[PDB]
Amino acid sequence: SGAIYVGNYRVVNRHLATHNDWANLVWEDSSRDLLVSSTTAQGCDTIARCDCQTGVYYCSSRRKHYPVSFSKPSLIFVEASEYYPARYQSHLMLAVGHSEPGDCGGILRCQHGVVGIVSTGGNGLVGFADVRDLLWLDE
Numbered sequence: 001s002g003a004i005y006v007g008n009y010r011v012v013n014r015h016l017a018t019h020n021d022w023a024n025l026v027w028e029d030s031s032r033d034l035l036v037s038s039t040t041a042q043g044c045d046t047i048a049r050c051d052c053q054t055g056v057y058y059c060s061s062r063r064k065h066y067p068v069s070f071s072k073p074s075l076i077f078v079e080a081s082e083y084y085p086a087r088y089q090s091h092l093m094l095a096v097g098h099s100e101p102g103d104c105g106g107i108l109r110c111q112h113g114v115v116g117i118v119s120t121g122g123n124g125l126v127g128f129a130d131v132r133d134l135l136w137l138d139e
């Protein structure tokens with residue numbers, strides 16, 4: 001679990017969004033596993049605006065942060081689950097690292113700010129849903 005709080009927005013994994021998220025929906029994209037809902041309280045997370053391929057992510061199944069090299073946001077095949085049929089997930093970045101179910105929502109950060117959140121895992125690989133292209137999160 002986990003979310004990004006920036007301005008009047010909350011960014012979460014779409015497959016983990018609540019009734020409240022859906023009732024205050026701003027934007028969602030099933031192909032990205034992202035949903036953005038509105039909040040009354042102001043958020044202070046800074047979003048990175050860069051092409052960094054190195055950063056640190058939070059892994060809740062180990063209660064530890066890990067430094068990683070990660071790929072550029074791309075269309076990657078993702079296996080069927082209780083949330084989605086087998087499909088290509090877009091804007092996804094992979095890194096060699098640990099992740100298990102329950103890790104989704106952990107933030108990936110570089111020196112510039114928040115890059116994305118854990119969205120996929122398995123086979124010693126962790127996938128992050130990129131948020132750096134969502135320029136409207138700042139305004």
Ligand SMILES: CSc1c(NC(=O)N2CCC[C@H](C(N)=O)C2)c(C)nn1C
Pocket residue numbers: 015033078081083084089099100101102103104119120121122123
């Ligand atoms: C999060 S780590 C993980 C998962 N979770 C996923 O990769 N998933 C499951 C939740 C939805 C994700 C998506 N973006 O479609 C896909 C699994 C099935 N094994 N391991 C080790």
Ligand SMILES: [Zn+2]
Pocket residue numbers: 048049050051052110111112113
């Ligand atoms: Zn960066």
